[PDB]
C-alpha cells in the first residue's frame, strides 16, 4: 500500500471576504450626540457660574463690612 499526502479543503477558508463594515456610527446620528453634548455642556457650566455669583458678591461684601481693618 502507498501512503502519500492527502488532500483536504473542507470549507475552502472563503476566498476573499470583506471584513470592513460600518459600525456604531452612522453619520447624522453622531452629530445629534456630538452637538447635543455641547448644548448640555454650556447649560450645566453656566448654572455653576450663576452659583459662583452668590459667593462672589458675598466675598466682596466682607471688605465693605470690615472698616476697622
Amino acid at each position: 500500500x502507498x501512503x502519500x499526502x492527502x488532500x483536504x479543503x473542507x470549507x475552502x477558508x472563503x476566498x476573499x471576504x470583506x471584513x470592513x463594515x460600518x459600525x456604531x456610527x452612522x453619520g447624522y446620528s453622531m452629530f445629534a450626540v456630538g452637538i447635543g453634548a455641547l448644548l448640555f455642556g454650556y447649560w450645566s457650566m453656566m448654572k455653576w457660574n450663576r452659583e459662583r455669583r452668590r459667593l462672589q458678591i458675598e466675598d466682596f461684601e466682607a471688605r465693605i463690612a470690615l472698616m476697622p481693618l
Binding site: 501512503x3 502519500x4 499526502x5 488532500x7 483536504x8 470549507x11 477558508x13
Partner: peptide, 16 residues
Amino acid sequence: QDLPLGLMDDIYEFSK
C-alpha cells in the same frame, strides 16, 4: 522531497 503527513492538515488549519 515529498510533503510529510503532518503538513497537509496544517495548511488547511493555517488558511482557515
